[PDB]
Design an enzyme around this catalytic site. Structure first.
Site, PDB file in Angstrom:
ATOM      1  N   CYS A 107       0.776  -1.258   0.000  1.00 51.30           N
ATOM      2  CA  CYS A 107       0.000   0.000   0.000  1.00 51.30           C
ATOM      3  C   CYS A 107       0.807   1.308   0.000  1.00 51.30           C
ATOM      4  CB  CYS A 107      -1.004   0.027   1.166  1.00 51.30           C
ATOM      5  SG  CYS A 107      -2.185   1.437   1.096  1.00 51.30           S
ATOM      6  N   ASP A 110      -4.122  -9.531   1.910  1.00 55.06           N
ATOM      7  CA  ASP A 110      -3.889 -10.091   0.574  1.00 55.06           C
ATOM      8  C   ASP A 110      -3.522 -11.591   0.503  1.00 55.06           C
ATOM      9  OD1 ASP A 110      -4.382  -7.697  -0.446  1.00 55.06           O
ATOM     10  OD2 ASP A 110      -2.402  -7.377  -1.397  1.00 55.06           O
ATOM     11  N   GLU A 116      -8.260  -7.447  -2.092  1.00 53.79           N
ATOM     12  CA  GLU A 116      -6.963  -6.832  -1.904  1.00 53.79           C
ATOM     13  C   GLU A 116      -7.096  -5.328  -1.760  1.00 53.79           C
ATOM     14  OE1 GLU A 116      -3.744  -8.227  -4.292  1.00 53.79           O
ATOM     15  OE2 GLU A 116      -4.524 -10.294  -4.453  1.00 53.79           O
ATOM     16  N   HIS A 125     -26.333  20.444  -6.115  1.00 56.35           N
ATOM     17  CA  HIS A 125     -26.159  20.940  -7.473  1.00 56.35           C
ATOM     18  C   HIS A 125     -25.100  22.031  -7.503  1.00 56.35           C
ATOM     19  CE1 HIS A 125     -27.268  21.964 -11.538  1.00 56.35           C
ATOM     20  NE2 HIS A 125     -27.626  23.192 -11.202  1.00 56.35           N
TER      21      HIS A 125
HETATM   22  C1  LIG Z   1      -0.156  -1.282  -7.825  1.00 53.96           C
HETATM   23  C2  LIG Z   1      -1.152  -1.397  -6.699  1.00 53.96           C
HETATM   24  C3  LIG Z   1      -2.070  -0.399  -6.422  1.00 53.96           C
HETATM   25  C4  LIG Z   1      -2.979  -0.521  -5.370  1.00 53.96           C
HETATM   26  N1  LIG Z   1      -3.861   0.494  -5.130  1.00 53.96           N
HETATM   27  C5  LIG Z   1      -4.751   0.390  -4.111  1.00 53.96           C
HETATM   28  C6  LIG Z   1      -5.696   1.400  -3.824  1.00 53.96           C
HETATM   29  O1  LIG Z   1      -5.738   2.568  -4.581  1.00 53.96           O
HETATM   30  N2  LIG Z   1      -6.562   1.263  -2.798  1.00 53.96           N
HETATM   31  C7  LIG Z   1      -6.546   0.156  -2.028  1.00 53.96           C
HETATM   32  O2  LIG Z   1      -7.453   0.007  -0.938  1.00 53.96           O
HETATM   33  N3  LIG Z   1      -5.655  -0.819  -2.290  1.00 53.96           N
HETATM   34  C8  LIG Z   1      -4.750  -0.753  -3.309  1.00 53.96           C
HETATM   35  N4  LIG Z   1      -3.868  -1.775  -3.544  1.00 53.96           N
HETATM   36  C9  LIG Z   1      -3.954  -2.951  -2.648  1.00 53.96           C
HETATM   37  C10 LIG Z   1      -3.291  -2.823  -1.296  1.00 53.96           C
HETATM   38  O3  LIG Z   1      -2.031  -2.289  -1.537  1.00 53.96           O
HETATM   39  C11 LIG Z   1      -3.147  -4.118  -0.527  1.00 53.96           C
HETATM   40  O4  LIG Z   1      -4.362  -4.742  -0.466  1.00 53.96           O
HETATM   41  C12 LIG Z   1      -2.695  -3.913   0.897  1.00 53.96           C
HETATM   42  O5  LIG Z   1      -1.426  -3.338   0.949  1.00 53.96           O
HETATM   43  C13 LIG Z   1      -2.622  -5.220   1.635  1.00 53.96           C
HETATM   44  O6  LIG Z   1      -1.888  -5.234   2.808  1.00 53.96           O
HETATM   45  P1  LIG Z   1      -1.576  -6.621   3.484  1.00 53.96           P
HETATM   46  O7  LIG Z   1      -1.569  -6.485   5.007  1.00 53.96           O
HETATM   47  O8  LIG Z   1      -2.733  -7.533   3.057  1.00 53.96           O
HETATM   48  O9  LIG Z   1      -0.191  -7.123   2.843  1.00 53.96           O
HETATM   49  P2  LIG Z   1       0.988  -6.212   2.242  1.00 53.96           P
HETATM   50  O10 LIG Z   1       0.653  -4.781   1.913  1.00 53.96           O
HETATM   51  O11 LIG Z   1       1.436  -6.870   0.939  1.00 53.96           O
HETATM   52  O12 LIG Z   1       2.172  -6.120   3.302  1.00 53.96           O
HETATM   53  C14 LIG Z   1       2.906  -7.242   3.671  1.00 53.96           C
HETATM   54  C15 LIG Z   1       4.333  -7.076   4.047  1.00 53.96           C
HETATM   55  O13 LIG Z   1       4.842  -8.349   4.342  1.00 53.96           O
HETATM   56  C16 LIG Z   1       6.151  -8.388   3.834  1.00 53.96           C
HETATM   57  N5  LIG Z   1       6.636  -9.804   3.800  1.00 53.96           N
HETATM   58  C17 LIG Z   1       6.359 -10.855   3.003  1.00 53.96           C
HETATM   59  N6  LIG Z   1       7.045 -11.936   3.449  1.00 53.96           N
HETATM   60  C18 LIG Z   1       7.755 -11.570   4.550  1.00 53.96           C
HETATM   61  C19 LIG Z   1       8.637 -12.219   5.441  1.00 53.96           C
HETATM   62  N7  LIG Z   1       8.971 -13.597   5.299  1.00 53.96           N
HETATM   63  N8  LIG Z   1       9.186 -11.557   6.466  1.00 53.96           N
HETATM   64  C20 LIG Z   1       8.902 -10.266   6.649  1.00 53.96           C
HETATM   65  N9  LIG Z   1       8.081  -9.599   5.831  1.00 53.96           N
HETATM   66  C21 LIG Z   1       7.487 -10.218   4.780  1.00 53.96           C
HETATM   67  C22 LIG Z   1       6.073  -7.478   2.608  1.00 53.96           C
HETATM   68  O14 LIG Z   1       7.307  -6.845   2.337  1.00 53.96           O
HETATM   69  C23 LIG Z   1       5.145  -6.511   2.954  1.00 53.96           C
HETATM   70  O15 LIG Z   1       5.812  -5.307   3.418  1.00 53.96           O
HETATM   71  C24 LIG Z   1      -2.972  -1.664  -4.578  1.00 53.96           C
HETATM   72  C25 LIG Z   1      -2.050  -2.664  -4.876  1.00 53.96           C
HETATM   73  C26 LIG Z   1      -1.150  -2.535  -5.926  1.00 53.96           C
HETATM   74  C27 LIG Z   1      -0.171  -3.616  -6.211  1.00 53.96           C
HETATM   75  C1  LIG Z   2     -24.156  33.507  -6.976  1.00 50.20           C
HETATM   76  C2  LIG Z   2     -25.115  32.382  -6.709  1.00 50.20           C
HETATM   77  C3  LIG Z   2     -24.633  31.085  -6.633  1.00 50.20           C
HETATM   78  C4  LIG Z   2     -25.503  30.004  -6.401  1.00 50.20           C
HETATM   79  N1  LIG Z   2     -24.960  28.777  -6.318  1.00 50.20           N
HETATM   80  C5  LIG Z   2     -25.729  27.693  -6.101  1.00 50.20           C
HETATM   81  C6  LIG Z   2     -25.150  26.411  -6.042  1.00 50.20           C
HETATM   82  O1  LIG Z   2     -23.781  26.233  -6.202  1.00 50.20           O
HETATM   83  N2  LIG Z   2     -25.917  25.339  -5.832  1.00 50.20           N
HETATM   84  C7  LIG Z   2     -27.240  25.486  -5.681  1.00 50.20           C
HETATM   85  O2  LIG Z   2     -28.009  24.333  -5.467  1.00 50.20           O
HETATM   86  N3  LIG Z   2     -27.830  26.697  -5.735  1.00 50.20           N
HETATM   87  C8  LIG Z   2     -27.109  27.835  -5.949  1.00 50.20           C
HETATM   88  N4  LIG Z   2     -27.691  29.075  -6.018  1.00 50.20           N
HETATM   89  C9  LIG Z   2     -29.159  29.122  -5.833  1.00 50.20           C
HETATM   90  C10 LIG Z   2     -30.011  29.088  -7.084  1.00 50.20           C
HETATM   91  O3  LIG Z   2     -29.468  30.031  -7.961  1.00 50.20           O
HETATM   92  C11 LIG Z   2     -31.480  29.378  -6.835  1.00 50.20           C
HETATM   93  O4  LIG Z   2     -31.807  28.828  -5.622  1.00 50.20           O
HETATM   94  C12 LIG Z   2     -32.430  28.804  -7.863  1.00 50.20           C
HETATM   95  O5  LIG Z   2     -32.314  29.450  -9.098  1.00 50.20           O
HETATM   96  C13 LIG Z   2     -33.855  28.865  -7.371  1.00 50.20           C
HETATM   97  O6  LIG Z   2     -34.891  28.635  -8.264  1.00 50.20           O
HETATM   98  P1  LIG Z   2     -36.238  29.495  -8.196  1.00 50.20           P
HETATM   99  O7  LIG Z   2     -37.296  28.861  -9.078  1.00 50.20           O
HETATM  100  O8  LIG Z   2     -36.776  29.511  -6.770  1.00 50.20           O
HETATM  101  O9  LIG Z   2     -35.929  31.019  -8.575  1.00 50.20           O
HETATM  102  P2  LIG Z   2     -35.204  31.594  -9.872  1.00 50.20           P
HETATM  103  O10 LIG Z   2     -34.147  30.621 -10.334  1.00 50.20           O
HETATM  104  O11 LIG Z   2     -34.477  32.889  -9.515  1.00 50.20           O
HETATM  105  O12 LIG Z   2     -36.285  31.918 -11.015  1.00 50.20           O
HETATM  106  C14 LIG Z   2     -36.757  33.225 -11.132  1.00 50.20           C
HETATM  107  C15 LIG Z   2     -37.164  33.830 -12.433  1.00 50.20           C
HETATM  108  O13 LIG Z   2     -38.236  34.707 -12.212  1.00 50.20           O
HETATM  109  C16 LIG Z   2     -38.085  35.776 -13.112  1.00 50.20           C
HETATM  110  N5  LIG Z   2     -39.078  36.872 -12.845  1.00 50.20           N
HETATM  111  C17 LIG Z   2     -39.205  37.755 -11.825  1.00 50.20           C
HETATM  112  N6  LIG Z   2     -40.303  38.517 -12.023  1.00 50.20           N
HETATM  113  C18 LIG Z   2     -40.906  38.105 -13.181  1.00 50.20           C
HETATM  114  C19 LIG Z   2     -42.064  38.505 -13.913  1.00 50.20           C
HETATM  115  N7  LIG Z   2     -42.904  39.564 -13.461  1.00 50.20           N
HETATM  116  N8  LIG Z   2     -42.400  37.882 -15.059  1.00 50.20           N
HETATM  117  C20 LIG Z   2     -41.626  36.875 -15.515  1.00 50.20           C
HETATM  118  N9  LIG Z   2     -40.513  36.456 -14.873  1.00 50.20           N
HETATM  119  C21 LIG Z   2     -40.127  37.048 -13.702  1.00 50.20           C
HETATM  120  C22 LIG Z   2     -36.581  35.965 -13.054  1.00 50.20           C
HETATM  121  O14 LIG Z   2     -36.065  36.710 -14.144  1.00 50.20           O
HETATM  122  C23 LIG Z   2     -36.098  34.661 -13.031  1.00 50.20           C
HETATM  123  O15 LIG Z   2     -35.791  34.125 -14.349  1.00 50.20           O
HETATM  124  C24 LIG Z   2     -26.884  30.179  -6.252  1.00 50.20           C
HETATM  125  C25 LIG Z   2     -27.352  31.499  -6.332  1.00 50.20           C
HETATM  126  C26 LIG Z   2     -26.488  32.585  -6.554  1.00 50.20           C
HETATM  127  C27 LIG Z   2     -27.097  33.944  -6.645  1.00 50.20           C
END
Ligand SMILES: Cc1cc2nc3c(=O)[nH]c(=O)nc-3n(C[C@H](O)[C@H](O)[C@H](O)COP(=O)(O)OP(=O)(O)OC[C@H]3O[C@@H](n4cnc5c(N)ncnc54)[C@H](O)[C@@H]3O)c2cc1C
Ligand SMILES: Cc1cc2nc3c(=O)[nH]c(=O)nc-3n(C[C@H](O)[C@H](O)[C@H](O)COP(=O)(O)OP(=O)(O)OC[C@H]3O[C@@H](n4cnc5c(N)ncnc54)[C@H](O)[C@@H]3O)c2cc1C
EC number: 1.8.1.9
Lengths: 504, 105, 504, 105
Positions: free
Chosen positions: C51, C320, C327, C472
């Site tokens: 790991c 493993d 694994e 969103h």
């Molecule tokens: C390329 C790769 C990518 C991976 N990516 C991920 C990931 O993104 N996410 C994830 O959850 N898992 C990932 N894994 C899996 C993860 O690495 C293993 O499942 C985890 O390390 C298992 O640990 P372990 O305790 O089972 O054995 P090991 O990690 O293999 O450790 C055992 C140790 O025992 C030692 N050993 C062996 N024989 C002896 C001995 N006679 N005396 C002393 N020491 C000994 C070894 O040197 C080793 O250090 C990946 C594996 C690989 C190969």
């Molecule tokens: C800067 C900013 C960032 C935001 N970021 C997020 C976010 O990351 N995630 C998230 O979930 N929400 C976000 N929001 C919230 C989101 O924009 C609003 O909550 C959403 O648009 C609400 O929908 P609504 O139907 O209640 O109102 P509105 O979307 O405002 O609909 C209103 C409409 O009524 C119209 N209107 C007003 N009077 C009249 C009329 N007399 N005749 C016809 N049309 C009229 C307006 O022009 C408008 O088109 C953000 C808001 C702002 C300002």
């Protein structure tokens, strides 16, 4: 009685469009209005509402742009990549983003047509509890009228620029403008500290601009504050400056620049001022006064109940314009759809606003679902909730040994960045540690949180996390071996790494 | 005087026991922060001659580290006739200087 | 009876270390042996097993290196970034990766020491059902011996190079060698089609090398094949070539290059041949013959039961090297830990090998948990399982309009790439659509799948996915509005985008 | 002859009805593939004079598209006295050429 349509909906955003298309698919004759009143600076756009044109979609696109840049500047050299003269072209980014928005505009339009919904690009208001007046293409010369059995209001929200700040409404841009801006943003002041402020500051900074954030009080109000600080700190350590407790009091146009007088009496020159303090329901030009529909006047939002009903029995509201409903597109869609089924399919499903997952796209992302730590304490009692948590470093970033941007450097030795990630679960001791809060700060938070929000919905207990095998090597697996609790007092800091100027 | 690299537990033991006042710098070649402060520590070996300055590669000289209980790098420990009396952790030059004058100014 | 230690474990990888540290924390006196016998090409490394040194950790690191490169070459120009003379330096990558592995080596060592586990870098075998012989630092001059109440074998696996291929064992490298290679890999032939083969081909290609993959029959054998083809196609469209059904028959050393004669009688010259066809249990030098311990001789793996017991009542195997166990590092950790608790804490928890999440890091990632579509049919009956699925494009990539690499271009008009993602749920009709299979192809699959594996563990039904609000804009949310089924016959192809030489 | 941009439904209707043989190219300015084939289509307007060549921006002239049932771009439809008789989709020049000679070689 008889009406021209079974369903007239005002607004072509996520909620309005979703409700219309569901209603149509159940037999309703449906008419939908959408019209975009220009922004403070005269920006306009196509159909789809805030989300597609001036919200989630273009925001995610530029976040990608910025994130990409951070990879180039911070990580690429370490991984063996060499390049010369890295510069970013804002104009090209904007055109790549607008091309895409315009393609979604088309597709959302043809989708309405396929679902047999008649769409009219016209400004709309209601003349009557079953009647809507409108004006083709904005032109107020001819008011035409139409009737409907049920009206849905889904006009959403627009950004608010405050009244008490001289030159603000006149000189500053908002989220309506940022994604299509014709000039390079340059030195930018962002005012506010909501997720929208922080997300724009973030990508603008990563893109290469000098960025300043003006924060009355705290950042991400409403959200778990440990995570808020974690996000804030990360941004700071990449360049963005936070004027804490210091808001602008006056703005003065001054050639191609803007001077800002601050409440501490200082002053500074900027290329762009971006107001992002909040959003008010777009309700003013709707004539709701003349039906006595109750609205919360501070929000400018319609008071609708748990069935999306106003106090007028034939008019409904969903999405951003209804008070107390989360401003998230998928939420407006679910409510729009559930409503349509209740009106035209005799369904009795009611919309569930609990455990709604959220994800903020700051240069280090934050996803959450359920209660913050602070709120679970208030609601349940500090002695009755367990918080399991763990700071840690992302594997890929860990191996780079990034360094703090100068501006975050206390002394010349304060070089290593803080730990990049946090995983935190908030649990109810007296219910076998049912998880009632999920928080994750780190990369790809949207992706991590989705499945976890589903688990919270299934009433997952902490033991279930412990019994699930984690996926290695991943940021998310940190949740599956999370044993350090707040009450235990033990260190939850990042174990290992070159953190704190020592390898340990 | 200057800094030398120790390559055996006996050598480390012999040098400290017989030499009275000793500082030792536990480093790792792969350790960024340890490298960051290596130059400055070479400097103090020259200026502050009222002490012995030495280095131990924690990977090479495995036995030493698994005894002085080294768990991070760089770790600085100062000795008196043979017994550790103080210990500092980190690549903060100011801290290190502060430490050395405390026992060798 | 009396022994020198309550627990002696052979192997310092995920499983052996985890079991040792748990056992220690419950009072056991523990001794752990780890020794790295060099690879076919003489490569060696520190403690931590496969790991950390030659598996998950360095593999993820170089995947990042490659992914990064794909971003530079395919996407960066579209998002507004300009640069000159992009080249990758392999030497630098390798040193950044080894520096990191070497730091984890240290930390895994000091962790054993903290948990009070005595570690001896020595080659080990067993003389007896309670005795282990060893050799300090490999040196077979002095065999020393030690006794233990219980012995754990956790030696893991090494890559297998076949016997029937002349020059193979002598000239080709494996996964033990790739992450530390001193020469640029250059024109590379990868033989095999397991997740290890595909992952190394992928990053090597993205890094800029000409890469060829030989596959007898199918790719990603043992996994859901719709997803397999999706991954394969994506790699193909980025440059990697797949010699289908054509394996090497002979390899001949030829200066700084290698000639490969193929079973179709063709031949070609390469800089590197990388064998990655599978892994065999490292069991040979353990003297298990002289205890009559039953092993599966094809695998070279120890036959252990559901409690990690061999047929010798005092010896155990996990990870493993035990037959039938996945694994994956976290799997070997959980079994190691559960074993320790059973031996020294009178626990009666048994290790659960069902619904284990997995995630493959190919240039487009694939995560899964549960049954493939094909296997769920066989096991349950095609008419009894529903498959809901949907192809779609990642938002960020979508807006780039990437083009096929030449080698995947049928005609000069075949330019647009295929759809990038796939979401697929396999469900049991007769159990209210309990999801018994989760599959996701697309970016960040590890991050998406974790939470979803947890949901599968909670026995999630399709309806639970439908009632969860999506996040969103995200790739994962595609699962929360997944309504197109295989049986319905409707199109599950990517809706929209500019694929198929027309946008809409 | 050449290619002109239509900017009204009446104009589209009038031109096709009165002109007999007509091909029309429904394009979008934001559409990559549509742009990809725009030059070649300009070419055929010159060579094959046994037909009328025109363009419609599907975003500008909204009413037209919501009737010819345009759902993707570029979409090519050919007409005879006023009635559509064939329809092609895609940025494949060979396909387009193949189409035009079918009705205008
Ligand atoms: C390329 C790769 C990518 C991976 N990516 C991920 C990931 O993104 N996410 C994830 O959850 N898992 C990932 N894994 C899996 C993860 O690495 C293993 O499942 C985890 O390390 C298992 O640990 P372990 O305790 O089972 O054995 P090991 O990690 O293999 O450790 C055992 C140790 O025992 C030692 N050993 C062996 N024989 C002896 C001995 N006679 N005396 C002393 N020491 C000994 C070894 O040197 C080793 O250090 C990946 C594996 C690989 C190969
Ligand atoms: C800067 C900013 C960032 C935001 N970021 C997020 C976010 O990351 N995630 C998230 O979930 N929400 C976000 N929001 C919230 C989101 O924009 C609003 O909550 C959403 O648009 C609400 O929908 P609504 O139907 O209640 O109102 P509105 O979307 O405002 O609909 C209103 C409409 O009524 C119209 N209107 C007003 N009077 C009249 C009329 N007399 N005749 C016809 N049309 C009229 C307006 O022009 C408008 O088109 C953000 C808001 C702002 C300002």
């Amino acid at each position: 009685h008889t009406y021209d349509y079974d369903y007239v909906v005002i607004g072509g955003g996520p909620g309005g469009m979703a409700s219309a298309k569901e209603a149509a698919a159940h037999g309703a004759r449906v008419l939908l209005f959408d019209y975009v009143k220009p922004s403070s600076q005269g920006t306009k756009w196509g159909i789809g509402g805030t989300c597609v044109n001036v919200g989630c979609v273009p925001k995610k696109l530029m976040h990608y742009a910025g994130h990409m840049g951070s990879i180039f500047k911070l990580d690429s050299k370490a991984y063996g990549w060499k390049f010369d003269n890295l510069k970013h072209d804002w104009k090209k980014l904007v055109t790549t983003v607008q091309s895409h928005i315009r393609s979604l505009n088309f597709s959302y339009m043809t989708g309405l047509r396929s679902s047999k919904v008649k769409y009219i690009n016209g400004l709309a208001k209601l003349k009557d509890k079953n009647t809507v007046s409108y004006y083709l293409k904005g032109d107020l010369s001819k008011e035409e009228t139409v009737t409907g059995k049920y009206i849905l209001i889904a006009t959403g929200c627009r950004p608010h620029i405050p009244d008490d700040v001289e030159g603000a409404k006149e000189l500053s841009i908002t989220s309506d403008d940022i994604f299509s801006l014709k000039k390079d943003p340059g030195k930018t002041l962002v005012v506010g500290a909501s997720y929208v402020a922080l997300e724009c500051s973030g990508f603008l900074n990563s893109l290469g601009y000098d960025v300043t954030v003006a924060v009355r009080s705290i950042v991400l109000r409403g959200f778990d504050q440990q995570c808020a600080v974690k996000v804030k700190l990360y941004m700071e350590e990449q360049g963005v400056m936070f004027k804490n407790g210091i808001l602008p009091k006056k703005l003065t146009k001054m050639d191609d620049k803007i001077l800002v007088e601050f409440s501490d009496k200082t002053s500074e020159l900027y290329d762009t001022v971006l107001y992002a303090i909040g959003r008010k329901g777009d309700i003013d030009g709707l004539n709701l006064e003349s039906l006595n529909m109750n609205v919360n006047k501070s929000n400018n939002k319609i008071i609708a109940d748990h069935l999306s009903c106003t106090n007028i029995p034939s008019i409904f509201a969903v999405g951003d314009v209804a008070e107390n409903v989360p401003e998230l597109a998928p939420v407006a869609i679910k409510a729009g759809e559930i409503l349509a089924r209740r009106l035209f399919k005799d369904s009795d499903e009611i919309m569930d606003y609990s455990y709604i997952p959220t994800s903020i796209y700051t240069p280090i992302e934050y996803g959450a679902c359920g209660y913050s730590e602070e709120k679970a304490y208030e609601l349940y009692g500090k002695s009755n909730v367990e918080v399991f948590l763990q700071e840690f470093n992302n594997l890929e970033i860990s191996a780079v040994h990034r360094q703090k941007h100068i501006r975050a450097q206390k002394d010349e030795y304060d070089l290593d960045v803080s730990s990049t990630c946090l995983a935190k679960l908030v649990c109810l001791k007296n219910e076998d540690n049912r998880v009632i809060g999920f928080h994750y700060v780190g990369p790809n938070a949207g992706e991590v949180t989705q499945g976890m929000a589903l688990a919270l919905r299934l009433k997952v207990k902490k033991k279930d996390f412990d019994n699930c095998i984690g996926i290695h090597p991943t940021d998310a697996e940190s949740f599956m071996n999370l044993f350090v609790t707040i009450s235990s007092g033990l260190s939850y800091a990042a174990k290992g790494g070159s953190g704190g100027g020592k390898c340990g | 005087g200057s800094v030398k690299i120790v390559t055996s537990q006996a050598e480390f033991d012999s040098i400290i026991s017989q030499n009275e006042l000793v500082i030792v710098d536990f480093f790792a070649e792969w350790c960024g922060p340890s490298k960051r402060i290596a130059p400055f520590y070479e400097e103090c070996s020259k200026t502050y001659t009222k002490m012995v300055f030495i280095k131990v590669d924690v990977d090479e000289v495995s036995e030493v580290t698994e005894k002085e209980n080294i768990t991070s790098m760089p770790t600085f420990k100062v000795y008196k006739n043979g017994s550790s009396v103080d210990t500092l952790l980190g690549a903060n030059d100011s801290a290190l200087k502060q430490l050395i004058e405390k026992y060798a100014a």
